[PDB]
Amino acid sequence: KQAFLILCLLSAAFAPICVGIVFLGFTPDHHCQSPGVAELSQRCGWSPAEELNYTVPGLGPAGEAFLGQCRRYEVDWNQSALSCVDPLASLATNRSHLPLGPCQDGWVYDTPGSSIVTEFNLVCADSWKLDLFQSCLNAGFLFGSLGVGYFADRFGRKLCLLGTVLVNAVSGVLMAFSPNYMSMLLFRLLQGLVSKGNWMAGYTLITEFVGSGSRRTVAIMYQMAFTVGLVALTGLAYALPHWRWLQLAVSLPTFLFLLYYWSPSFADLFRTPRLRKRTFILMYLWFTDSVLYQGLILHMGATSGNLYLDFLYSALVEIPGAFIALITIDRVGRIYPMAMSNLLAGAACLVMIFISPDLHWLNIIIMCVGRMGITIAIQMICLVNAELYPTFVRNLGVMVCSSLCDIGGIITPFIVFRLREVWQALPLILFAVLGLLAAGVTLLLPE
Ligand SMILES: Cc1ncc(C[n+]2csc(CCO)c2C)c(N)n1
């Protein structure tokens, strides 16, 4: 059981890679930096809130945070004629008539730490570039899911695994030293090429080593290790407030993992109408579950008012989800539990639309229920997908079904970030529709 610790570490360290954007890429409050505002504030003695009151454009009806975050007044603050009580009052009849311009001189972020958003200025016009951080990782996942099988077929298995683990560790450490956004994106793609391949290889090894009398228990323990990795990520993110500090502390543990040492065809899946239907349903279920999981995590990261405690509470509820899945697998079945778990997540996403922002105590409960639901659904599907295919084409079908997860991971970040700008509740509407459809579709599969 000595190698069990390192094989579980291989899965625990995979958590910060796919979920670390919540802490490495947070967006703090910001406004246009102005050169003459600071001197006037020191002259008059403005408090931090009074400076925002007197300088940044107001919100107005319907929120409209765009005018305050991406625009500024072009008034010459260097003029001594400005009164300390209200400098904008004597300039015009109303503040709406003042000229506006972009933040030419930069931005001011109200945070003690840092992130990729604050360092690369991924705000306003460039705000879509933050979505590329996860899309590049998921494109790397998709390409690796094809490349790694070819590499392992034409090269030594153990040497290939060692090489991929070393590549992942080196790319993770190097990304903490990235000088610009393009190199960071390239390192992210390189890391995503090998991360999921290594995770799947470790899972396959740990399932092959253990006999049939304990395969399910170890498979569940593999996800328990991911949950423990999420908890450790939350702790490290609380301890290290800078994104470069957090990135090194995430990648370095995988280095000690190496330091511890020192024919089926694609056309087959759709040749039969029943097999075609099962393949389509499994593809849709994998896509829906991946979209729901990633979107819920990103939405929590983007809208929660207490990120650390919400993330900790959401991560913990996965463990009861794993226990419930384990109890329900051998007593009830696979179709009804999966349908119920998907319906629970869909209903939780639907309810969160109407909850008022001040009812945080209920919002966190609904979020935890939804996370437990998607966790149970994923645990069920990880067995349903595998056991619904014959042994001859089981692995190829599993790979094809899992590629839909990577495609959904590619698409998801633009749904959560960009579509929320059009309307805040729209991503939740999409998630509710997808969850309800997944609940409905699941019933068609045979028991
Ligand atoms: C991005 C992403 N990461 C992991 C999983 C699957 N998964 C592995 S461990 C775990 C939590 C315990 O069940 C889950 C959901 C997924 N579907 N999407």
GROMACS .gro file of C-alpha atoms and ligand atoms in nm:
model
  465
    1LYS     CA    1   0.000   0.000   0.000
    2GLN     CA    2   0.310   0.220  -0.019
    3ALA     CA    3   0.238   0.316  -0.380
    4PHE     CA    4  -0.124   0.392  -0.290
    5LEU     CA    5  -0.019   0.723  -0.133
    6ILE     CA    6   0.162   0.843  -0.445
    7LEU     CA    7  -0.110   0.715  -0.679
    8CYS     CA    8  -0.366   0.913  -0.477
    9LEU     CA    9  -0.134   1.216  -0.480
   10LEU     CA   10  -0.131   1.193  -0.860
   11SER     CA   11  -0.507   1.260  -0.851
   12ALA     CA   12  -0.503   1.509  -0.563
   13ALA     CA   13  -0.255   1.732  -0.749
   14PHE     CA   14  -0.480   1.730  -1.059
   15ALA     CA   15  -0.743   1.939  -0.879
   16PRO     CA   16  -0.563   2.279  -0.884
   17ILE     CA   17  -0.495   2.243  -1.258
   18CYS     CA   18  -0.859   2.240  -1.370
   19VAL     CA   19  -1.010   2.444  -1.083
   20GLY     CA   20  -0.729   2.687  -0.998
   21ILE     CA   21  -0.867   2.967  -1.216
   22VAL     CA   22  -1.105   3.054  -0.932
   23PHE     CA   23  -0.810   3.168  -0.718
   24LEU     CA   24  -0.545   3.250  -0.981
   25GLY     CA   25  -0.781   3.466  -1.185
   26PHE     CA   26  -1.014   3.657  -0.954
   27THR     CA   27  -1.140   3.997  -1.069
   28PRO     CA   28  -1.131   4.268  -0.800
   29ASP     CA   29  -1.303   4.605  -0.808
   30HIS     CA   30  -1.129   4.855  -1.034
   31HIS     CA   31  -1.155   5.198  -1.196
   32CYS     CA   32  -0.951   5.412  -1.432
   33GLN     CA   33  -0.624   5.525  -1.279
   34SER     CA   34  -0.585   5.902  -1.305
   35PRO     CA   35  -0.260   6.094  -1.253
   36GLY     CA   36  -0.392   6.406  -1.079
   37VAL     CA   37  -0.653   6.250  -0.851
   38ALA     CA   38  -0.404   6.127  -0.590
   39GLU     CA   39  -0.245   6.470  -0.539
   40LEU     CA   40  -0.584   6.637  -0.494
   41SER     CA   41  -0.691   6.367  -0.248
   42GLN     CA   42  -0.377   6.424  -0.040
   43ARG     CA   43  -0.431   6.801  -0.056
   44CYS     CA   44  -0.791   6.774   0.066
   45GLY     CA   45  -0.755   6.463   0.282
   46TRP     CA   46  -1.014   6.239   0.116
   47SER     CA   47  -1.099   5.903   0.266
   48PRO     CA   48  -1.085   5.600   0.032
   49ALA     CA   49  -1.465   5.603  -0.001
   50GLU     CA   50  -1.481   5.982  -0.039
   51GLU     CA   51  -1.232   5.967  -0.328
   52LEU     CA   52  -1.453   5.714  -0.508
   53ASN     CA   53  -1.756   5.934  -0.438
   54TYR     CA   54  -1.589   6.246  -0.579
   55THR     CA   55  -1.399   6.101  -0.873
   56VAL     CA   56  -1.529   5.778  -1.031
   57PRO     CA   57  -1.844   5.806  -1.247
   58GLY     CA   58  -2.156   5.689  -1.067
   59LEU     CA   59  -2.354   5.372  -1.124
   60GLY     CA   60  -2.700   5.507  -1.207
   61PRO     CA   61  -3.005   5.302  -1.303
   62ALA     CA   62  -2.980   4.928  -1.373
   63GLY     CA   63  -2.635   4.918  -1.213
   64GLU     CA   64  -2.429   5.012  -1.520
   65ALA     CA   65  -2.087   4.944  -1.371
   66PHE     CA   66  -1.930   4.994  -1.716
   67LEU     CA   67  -1.913   5.374  -1.687
   68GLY     CA   68  -1.724   5.355  -1.357
   69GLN     CA   69  -1.486   5.072  -1.441
   70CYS     CA   70  -1.401   5.140  -1.807
   71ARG     CA   71  -1.442   5.519  -1.828
   72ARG     CA   72  -1.310   5.831  -1.657
   73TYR     CA   73  -1.367   6.205  -1.652
   74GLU     CA   74  -1.119   6.415  -1.852
   75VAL     CA   75  -1.120   6.707  -1.608
   76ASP     CA   76  -0.783   6.870  -1.536
   77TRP     CA   77  -0.743   6.771  -1.172
   78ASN     CA   78  -0.424   6.981  -1.149
   79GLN     CA   79  -0.628   7.303  -1.134
   80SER     CA   80  -0.618   7.454  -0.785
   81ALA     CA   81  -0.965   7.607  -0.830
   82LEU     CA   82  -1.129   7.273  -0.744
   83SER     CA   83  -1.307   7.284  -0.409
   84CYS     CA   84  -1.245   7.009  -0.154
   85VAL     CA   85  -1.615   6.973  -0.066
   86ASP     CA   86  -1.714   6.883  -0.423
   87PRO     CA   87  -1.475   6.944  -0.716
   88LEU     CA   88  -1.720   6.837  -0.989
   89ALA     CA   89  -2.002   7.066  -0.872
   90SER     CA   90  -1.847   7.391  -0.996
   91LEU     CA   91  -1.747   7.248  -1.336
   92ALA     CA   92  -2.088   7.192  -1.499
   93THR     CA   93  -2.461   7.177  -1.433
   94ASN     CA   94  -2.455   6.796  -1.420
   95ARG     CA   95  -2.183   6.532  -1.418
   96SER     CA   96  -2.342   6.359  -1.719
   97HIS     CA   97  -2.225   6.641  -1.949
   98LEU     CA   98  -1.857   6.594  -1.863
   99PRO     CA   99  -1.637   6.428  -2.129
  100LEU     CA  100  -1.544   6.062  -2.093
  101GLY     CA  101  -1.250   5.854  -2.210
  102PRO     CA  102  -1.086   5.513  -2.172
  103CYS     CA  103  -0.837   5.422  -1.900
  104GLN     CA  104  -0.528   5.530  -2.092
  105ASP     CA  105  -0.299   5.537  -1.787
  106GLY     CA  106  -0.407   5.203  -1.639
  107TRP     CA  107  -0.624   5.068  -1.360
  108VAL     CA  108  -0.640   5.058  -0.980
  109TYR     CA  109  -0.737   4.726  -0.822
  110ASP     CA  110  -0.871   4.717  -0.465
  111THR     CA  111  -0.702   4.398  -0.345
  112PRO     CA  112  -0.397   4.320  -0.129
  113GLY     CA  113  -0.289   4.022  -0.341
  114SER     CA  114  -0.270   3.974  -0.716
  115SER     CA  115  -0.398   3.756  -0.998
  116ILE     CA  116  -0.360   3.713  -1.372
  117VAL     CA  117  -0.642   3.964  -1.427
  118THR     CA  118  -0.469   4.237  -1.227
  119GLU     CA  119  -0.124   4.165  -1.372
  120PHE     CA  120  -0.216   4.136  -1.741
  121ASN     CA  121  -0.502   4.391  -1.713
  122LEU     CA  122  -0.767   4.151  -1.845
  123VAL     CA  123  -1.052   4.397  -1.783
  124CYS     CA  124  -1.315   4.573  -1.994
  125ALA     CA  125  -1.212   4.535  -2.359
  126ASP     CA  126  -0.969   4.248  -2.289
  127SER     CA  127  -1.200   4.076  -2.039
  128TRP     CA  128  -1.271   3.795  -2.286
  129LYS     CA  129  -0.905   3.689  -2.265
  130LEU     CA  130  -0.966   3.543  -1.918
  131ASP     CA  131  -1.193   3.282  -2.078
  132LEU     CA  132  -0.902   3.164  -2.295
  133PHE     CA  133  -0.725   3.045  -1.978
  134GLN     CA  134  -0.969   2.754  -1.938
  135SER     CA  135  -1.042   2.704  -2.308
  136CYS     CA  136  -0.672   2.649  -2.379
  137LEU     CA  137  -0.652   2.390  -2.099
  138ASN     CA  138  -0.956   2.205  -2.233
  139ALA     CA  139  -0.823   2.216  -2.591
  140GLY     CA  140  -0.505   2.063  -2.451
  141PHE     CA  141  -0.721   1.796  -2.286
  142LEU     CA  142  -0.896   1.721  -2.616
  143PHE     CA  143  -0.572   1.695  -2.814
  144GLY     CA  144  -0.401   1.489  -2.544
  145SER     CA  145  -0.687   1.239  -2.534
  146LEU     CA  146  -0.581   1.146  -2.889
  147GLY     CA  147  -0.205   1.201  -2.867
  148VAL     CA  148  -0.135   1.005  -2.549
  149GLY     CA  149  -0.286   0.680  -2.676
  150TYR     CA  150  -0.073   0.697  -2.991
  151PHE     CA  151   0.238   0.778  -2.786
  152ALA     CA  152   0.178   0.489  -2.544
  153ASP     CA  153   0.109   0.254  -2.836
  154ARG     CA  154   0.433   0.341  -3.016
  155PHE     CA  155   0.653   0.388  -2.705
  156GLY     CA  156   0.728   0.221  -2.373
  157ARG     CA  157   0.444   0.254  -2.123
  158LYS     CA  158   0.647   0.326  -1.809
  159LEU     CA  159   0.887   0.559  -1.992
  160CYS     CA  160   0.594   0.742  -2.153
  161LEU     CA  161   0.426   0.790  -1.815
  162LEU     CA  162   0.751   0.914  -1.659
  163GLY     CA  163   0.805   1.156  -1.946
  164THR     CA  164   0.452   1.292  -1.927
  165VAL     CA  165   0.469   1.340  -1.549
  166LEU     CA  166   0.800   1.524  -1.588
  167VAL     CA  167   0.656   1.739  -1.868
  168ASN     CA  168   0.352   1.825  -1.655
  169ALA     CA  169   0.566   1.919  -1.354
  170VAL     CA  170   0.810   2.130  -1.556
  171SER     CA  171   0.528   2.310  -1.739
  172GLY     CA  172   0.352   2.378  -1.409
  173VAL     CA  173   0.664   2.524  -1.248
  174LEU     CA  174   0.759   2.725  -1.558
  175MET     CA  175   0.414   2.886  -1.589
  176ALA     CA  176   0.470   3.056  -1.253
  177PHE     CA  177   0.757   3.244  -1.422
  178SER     CA  178   0.566   3.340  -1.738
  179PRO     CA  179   0.657   3.693  -1.856
  180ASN     CA  180   0.347   3.761  -2.068
  181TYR     CA  181   0.005   3.620  -2.150
  182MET     CA  182   0.098   3.436  -2.471
  183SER     CA  183   0.370   3.227  -2.307
  184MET     CA  184   0.138   3.153  -2.015
  185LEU     CA  185  -0.128   3.033  -2.260
  186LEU     CA  186   0.125   2.811  -2.439
  187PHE     CA  187   0.237   2.659  -2.107
  188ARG     CA  188  -0.128   2.609  -2.013
  189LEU     CA  189  -0.190   2.422  -2.339
  190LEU     CA  190   0.123   2.211  -2.289
  191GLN     CA  191   0.017   2.122  -1.934
  192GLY     CA  192  -0.335   2.033  -2.047
  193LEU     CA  193  -0.191   1.805  -2.315
  194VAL     CA  194  -0.051   1.570  -2.050
  195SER     CA  195  -0.247   1.631  -1.727
  196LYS     CA  196  -0.564   1.440  -1.815
  197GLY     CA  197  -0.361   1.169  -1.985
  198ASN     CA  198  -0.162   1.113  -1.667
  199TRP     CA  199  -0.480   1.115  -1.457
  200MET     CA  200  -0.649   0.856  -1.680
  201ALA     CA  201  -0.334   0.641  -1.688
  202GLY     CA  202  -0.312   0.643  -1.309
  203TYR     CA  203  -0.680   0.553  -1.279
  204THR     CA  204  -0.639   0.265  -1.526
  205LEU     CA  205  -0.331   0.137  -1.342
  206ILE     CA  206  -0.499   0.153  -1.002
  207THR     CA  207  -0.806  -0.027  -1.138
  208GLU     CA  208  -0.599  -0.298  -1.308
  209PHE     CA  209  -0.380  -0.366  -1.003
  210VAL     CA  210  -0.672  -0.420  -0.765
  211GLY     CA  211  -0.895  -0.722  -0.810
  212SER     CA  212  -1.268  -0.729  -0.875
  213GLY     CA  213  -1.343  -0.750  -0.502
  214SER     CA  214  -1.223  -0.393  -0.441
  215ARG     CA  215  -1.218  -0.214  -0.779
  216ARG     CA  216  -1.519   0.005  -0.697
  217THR     CA  217  -1.386   0.108  -0.355
  218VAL     CA  218  -1.052   0.218  -0.501
  219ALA     CA  219  -1.226   0.394  -0.790
  220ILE     CA  220  -1.428   0.596  -0.538
  221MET     CA  221  -1.116   0.663  -0.328
  222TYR     CA  222  -0.962   0.810  -0.644
  223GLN     CA  223  -1.232   1.081  -0.646
  224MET     CA  224  -1.199   1.124  -0.269
  225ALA     CA  225  -0.836   1.214  -0.336
  226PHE     CA  226  -0.954   1.482  -0.581
  227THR     CA  227  -1.182   1.625  -0.311
  228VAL     CA  228  -0.891   1.631  -0.064
  229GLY     CA  229  -0.688   1.810  -0.331
  230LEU     CA  230  -0.962   2.071  -0.362
  231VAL     CA  231  -0.955   2.126   0.015
  232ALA     CA  232  -0.575   2.160   0.008
  233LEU     CA  233  -0.606   2.406  -0.281
  234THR     CA  234  -0.847   2.619  -0.077
  235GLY     CA  235  -0.609   2.616   0.219
  236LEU     CA  236  -0.308   2.710   0.006
  237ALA     CA  237  -0.504   2.986  -0.167
  238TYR     CA  238  -0.592   3.130   0.173
  239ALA     CA  239  -0.228   3.107   0.284
  240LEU     CA  240  -0.069   3.249  -0.036
  241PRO     CA  241  -0.242   3.564  -0.166
  242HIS     CA  242  -0.034   3.606  -0.486
  243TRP     CA  243  -0.092   3.395  -0.796
  244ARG     CA  244   0.278   3.332  -0.860
  245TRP     CA  245   0.322   3.211  -0.501
  246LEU     CA  246   0.022   2.979  -0.531
  247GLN     CA  247   0.136   2.837  -0.866
  248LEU     CA  248   0.474   2.723  -0.733
  249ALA     CA  249   0.320   2.563  -0.424
  250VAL     CA  250   0.082   2.372  -0.651
  251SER     CA  251   0.335   2.240  -0.904
  252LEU     CA  252   0.618   2.156  -0.663
  253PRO     CA  253   0.447   1.854  -0.494
  254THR     CA  254   0.437   1.668  -0.827
  255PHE     CA  255   0.815   1.713  -0.851
  256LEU     CA  256   0.865   1.511  -0.532
  257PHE     CA  257   0.659   1.236  -0.698
  258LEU     CA  258   0.947   1.180  -0.941
  259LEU     CA  259   1.204   1.261  -0.671
  260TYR     CA  260   1.060   0.970  -0.472
  261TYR     CA  261   1.195   0.740  -0.743
  262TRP     CA  262   1.534   0.915  -0.741
  263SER     CA  263  -0.942  -0.421  -3.367
  264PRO     CA  264  -1.211  -0.169  -3.269
  265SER     CA  265  -1.306   0.102  -3.516
  266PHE     CA  266  -1.486   0.434  -3.482
  267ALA     CA  267  -1.754   0.321  -3.728
  268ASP     CA  268  -1.850   0.038  -3.490
  269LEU     CA  269  -2.004   0.274  -3.233
  270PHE     CA  270  -2.288   0.373  -3.469
  271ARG     CA  271  -2.339   0.063  -3.687
  272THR     CA  272  -2.633  -0.054  -3.473
  273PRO     CA  273  -2.937   0.167  -3.404
  274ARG     CA  274  -2.946   0.062  -3.038
  275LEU     CA  275  -2.571   0.117  -3.006
  276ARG     CA  276  -2.610   0.449  -3.189
  277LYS     CA  277  -2.881   0.560  -2.945
  278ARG     CA  278  -2.675   0.455  -2.643
  279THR     CA  279  -2.367   0.633  -2.777
  280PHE     CA  280  -2.562   0.954  -2.842
  281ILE     CA  281  -2.721   0.945  -2.496
  282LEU     CA  282  -2.387   0.882  -2.323
  283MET     CA  283  -2.223   1.162  -2.523
  284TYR     CA  284  -2.497   1.402  -2.418
  285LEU     CA  285  -2.477   1.295  -2.054
  286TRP     CA  286  -2.099   1.341  -2.040
  287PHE     CA  287  -2.125   1.681  -2.210
  288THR     CA  288  -2.403   1.795  -1.976
  289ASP     CA  289  -2.230   1.678  -1.659
  290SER     CA  290  -1.898   1.840  -1.752
  291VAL     CA  291  -2.072   2.166  -1.845
  292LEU     CA  292  -2.274   2.169  -1.522
  293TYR     CA  293  -1.975   2.091  -1.299
  294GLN     CA  294  -1.737   2.346  -1.450
  295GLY     CA  295  -2.005   2.613  -1.492
  296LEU     CA  296  -2.125   2.581  -1.133
  297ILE     CA  297  -1.770   2.607  -1.000
  298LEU     CA  298  -1.692   2.910  -1.219
  299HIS     CA  299  -2.023   3.079  -1.130
  300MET     CA  300  -1.950   3.030  -0.760
  301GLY     CA  301  -1.602   3.173  -0.813
  302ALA     CA  302  -1.738   3.475  -1.000
  303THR     CA  303  -2.042   3.565  -0.785
  304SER     CA  304  -1.983   3.448  -0.425
  305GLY     CA  305  -1.918   3.712  -0.160
  306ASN     CA  306  -1.708   3.478   0.058
  307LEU     CA  307  -1.503   3.267  -0.182
  308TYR     CA  308  -1.292   3.063   0.061
  309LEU     CA  309  -1.570   2.943   0.292
  310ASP     CA  310  -1.811   2.880   0.004
  311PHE     CA  311  -1.547   2.676  -0.179
  312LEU     CA  312  -1.467   2.481   0.139
  313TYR     CA  313  -1.833   2.404   0.210
  314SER     CA  314  -1.898   2.305  -0.151
  315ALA     CA  315  -1.594   2.075  -0.161
  316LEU     CA  316  -1.689   1.893   0.160
  317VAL     CA  317  -2.036   1.793   0.038
  318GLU     CA  318  -1.874   1.579  -0.233
  319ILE     CA  319  -1.772   1.317   0.028
  320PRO     CA  320  -2.134   1.244   0.132
  321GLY     CA  321  -2.209   1.235  -0.241
  322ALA     CA  322  -1.947   0.965  -0.294
  323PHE     CA  323  -2.081   0.769   0.004
  324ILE     CA  324  -2.439   0.797  -0.124
  325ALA     CA  325  -2.329   0.682  -0.470
  326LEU     CA  326  -2.147   0.384  -0.320
  327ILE     CA  327  -2.449   0.286  -0.111
  328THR     CA  328  -2.696   0.333  -0.397
  329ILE     CA  329  -2.496   0.150  -0.666
  330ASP     CA  330  -2.528  -0.196  -0.512
  331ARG     CA  331  -2.881  -0.161  -0.369
  332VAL     CA  332  -3.099   0.039  -0.610
  333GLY     CA  333  -2.953   0.054  -0.961
  334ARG     CA  334  -2.793   0.293  -1.207
  335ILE     CA  335  -3.068   0.458  -1.414
  336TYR     CA  336  -3.301   0.601  -1.148
  337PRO     CA  337  -3.018   0.728  -0.920
  338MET     CA  338  -2.851   0.905  -1.213
  339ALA     CA  339  -3.177   1.060  -1.333
  340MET     CA  340  -3.260   1.176  -0.980
  341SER     CA  341  -2.912   1.321  -0.930
  342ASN     CA  342  -2.929   1.515  -1.257
  343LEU     CA  343  -3.280   1.640  -1.176
  344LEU     CA  344  -3.159   1.758  -0.835
  345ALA     CA  345  -2.880   1.965  -0.991
  346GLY     CA  346  -3.117   2.110  -1.251
  347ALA     CA  347  -3.372   2.209  -0.988
  348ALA     CA  348  -3.099   2.359  -0.769
  349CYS     CA  349  -2.981   2.570  -1.064
  350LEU     CA  350  -3.340   2.678  -1.133
  351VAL     CA  351  -3.409   2.783  -0.772
  352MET     CA  352  -3.095   2.998  -0.747
  353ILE     CA  353  -3.240   3.241  -1.004
  354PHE     CA  354  -3.510   3.373  -0.770
  355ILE     CA  355  -3.310   3.376  -0.445
  356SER     CA  356  -3.243   3.728  -0.321
  357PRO     CA  357  -2.873   3.825  -0.288
  358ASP     CA  358  -2.905   3.888   0.088
  359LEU     CA  359  -3.013   3.529   0.160
  360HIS     CA  360  -2.659   3.391   0.146
  361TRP     CA  361  -2.739   3.123   0.405
  362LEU     CA  362  -2.991   2.970   0.162
  363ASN     CA  363  -2.782   3.031  -0.151
  364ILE     CA  364  -2.491   2.831  -0.008
  365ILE     CA  365  -2.727   2.546   0.084
  366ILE     CA  366  -2.872   2.534  -0.268
  367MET     CA  367  -2.521   2.543  -0.415
  368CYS     CA  368  -2.413   2.253  -0.192
  369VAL     CA  369  -2.719   2.050  -0.291
  370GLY     CA  370  -2.645   2.109  -0.660
  371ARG     CA  371  -2.280   2.013  -0.618
  372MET     CA  372  -2.374   1.694  -0.435
  373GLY     CA  373  -2.619   1.613  -0.715
  374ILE     CA  374  -2.366   1.656  -0.995
  375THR     CA  375  -2.108   1.459  -0.795
  376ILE     CA  376  -2.349   1.166  -0.758
  377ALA     CA  377  -2.444   1.188  -1.127
  378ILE     CA  378  -2.079   1.179  -1.235
  379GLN     CA  379  -2.007   0.885  -1.003
  380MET     CA  380  -2.297   0.694  -1.157
  381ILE     CA  381  -2.201   0.776  -1.516
  382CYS     CA  382  -1.837   0.672  -1.462
  383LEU     CA  383  -1.969   0.315  -1.426
  384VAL     CA  384  -2.272   0.332  -1.657
  385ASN     CA  385  -2.063   0.445  -1.955
  386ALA     CA  386  -1.802   0.174  -1.896
  387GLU     CA  387  -2.042  -0.118  -1.848
  388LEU     CA  388  -2.279  -0.034  -2.135
  389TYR     CA  389  -2.027  -0.130  -2.404
  390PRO     CA  390  -1.894  -0.476  -2.492
  391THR     CA  391  -1.533  -0.548  -2.401
  392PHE     CA  392  -1.424  -0.545  -2.766
  393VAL     CA  393  -1.507  -0.175  -2.815
  394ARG     CA  394  -1.533  -0.062  -2.451
  395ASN     CA  395  -1.215   0.149  -2.437
  396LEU     CA  396  -1.262   0.326  -2.771
  397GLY     CA  397  -1.622   0.407  -2.680
  398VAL     CA  398  -1.508   0.540  -2.343
  399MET     CA  399  -1.252   0.766  -2.512
  400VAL     CA  400  -1.510   0.892  -2.762
  401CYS     CA  401  -1.760   0.965  -2.485
  402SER     CA  402  -1.496   1.141  -2.275
  403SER     CA  403  -1.400   1.369  -2.566
  404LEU     CA  404  -1.743   1.533  -2.529
  405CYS     CA  405  -1.641   1.631  -2.176
  406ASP     CA  406  -1.340   1.815  -2.321
  407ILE     CA  407  -1.555   1.986  -2.584
  408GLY     CA  408  -1.797   2.099  -2.313
  409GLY     CA  409  -1.502   2.227  -2.113
  410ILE     CA  410  -1.391   2.426  -2.417
  411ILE     CA  411  -1.735   2.583  -2.465
  412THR     CA  412  -1.825   2.643  -2.099
  413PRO     CA  413  -1.603   2.943  -2.001
  414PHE     CA  414  -1.763   3.167  -2.264
  415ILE     CA  415  -2.109   3.069  -2.139
  416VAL     CA  416  -2.034   3.157  -1.776
  417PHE     CA  417  -1.835   3.475  -1.838
  418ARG     CA  418  -1.956   3.633  -2.164
  419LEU     CA  419  -2.324   3.536  -2.156
  420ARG     CA  420  -2.355   3.659  -1.797
  421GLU     CA  421  -2.269   4.009  -1.919
  422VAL     CA  422  -2.581   4.009  -2.139
  423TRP     CA  423  -2.794   3.888  -1.847
  424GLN     CA  424  -2.679   3.759  -1.509
  425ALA     CA  425  -2.936   3.480  -1.475
  426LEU     CA  426  -2.896   3.346  -1.831
  427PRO     CA  427  -2.619   3.092  -1.748
  428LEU     CA  428  -2.841   2.954  -1.471
  429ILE     CA  429  -3.129   2.922  -1.719
  430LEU     CA  430  -2.903   2.729  -1.957
  431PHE     CA  431  -2.782   2.506  -1.673
  432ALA     CA  432  -3.139   2.436  -1.558
  433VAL     CA  433  -3.247   2.345  -1.912
  434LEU     CA  434  -2.946   2.116  -1.960
  435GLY     CA  435  -3.000   1.948  -1.624
  436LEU     CA  436  -3.369   1.886  -1.686
  437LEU     CA  437  -3.296   1.744  -2.033
  438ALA     CA  438  -3.023   1.519  -1.890
  439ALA     CA  439  -3.269   1.397  -1.626
  440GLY     CA  440  -3.526   1.323  -1.896
  441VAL     CA  441  -3.286   1.158  -2.141
  442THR     CA  442  -3.129   0.927  -1.881
  443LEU     CA  443  -3.454   0.733  -1.837
  444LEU     CA  444  -3.428   0.595  -2.193
  445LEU     CA  445  -3.121   0.381  -2.121
  446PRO     CA  446  -3.188   0.019  -2.020
  447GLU     CA  447  -3.143  -0.082  -1.658
  448LIG     C1  448  -1.329   1.934  -1.482
  448LIG     C2  449  -1.367   1.802  -1.425
  448LIG     N1  450  -1.284   1.749  -1.335
  448LIG     C3  451  -1.319   1.631  -1.285
  448LIG     C4  452  -1.434   1.564  -1.321
  448LIG     C5  453  -1.468   1.431  -1.261
  448LIG     N2  454  -1.436   1.425  -1.117
  448LIG     C6  455  -1.324   1.373  -1.073
  448LIG     S1  456  -1.312   1.378  -0.907
  448LIG     C7  457  -1.466   1.454  -0.894
  448LIG     C8  458  -1.523   1.490  -0.761
  448LIG     C9  459  -1.564   1.367  -0.681
  448LIG     O1  460  -1.665   1.300  -0.752
  448LIG    C10  461  -1.519   1.472  -1.017
  448LIG    C11  462  -1.651   1.534  -1.045
  448LIG    C12  463  -1.515   1.628  -1.418
  448LIG     N3  464  -1.629   1.575  -1.463
  448LIG     N4  465  -1.479   1.747  -1.468
   0.00000   0.00000   0.00000
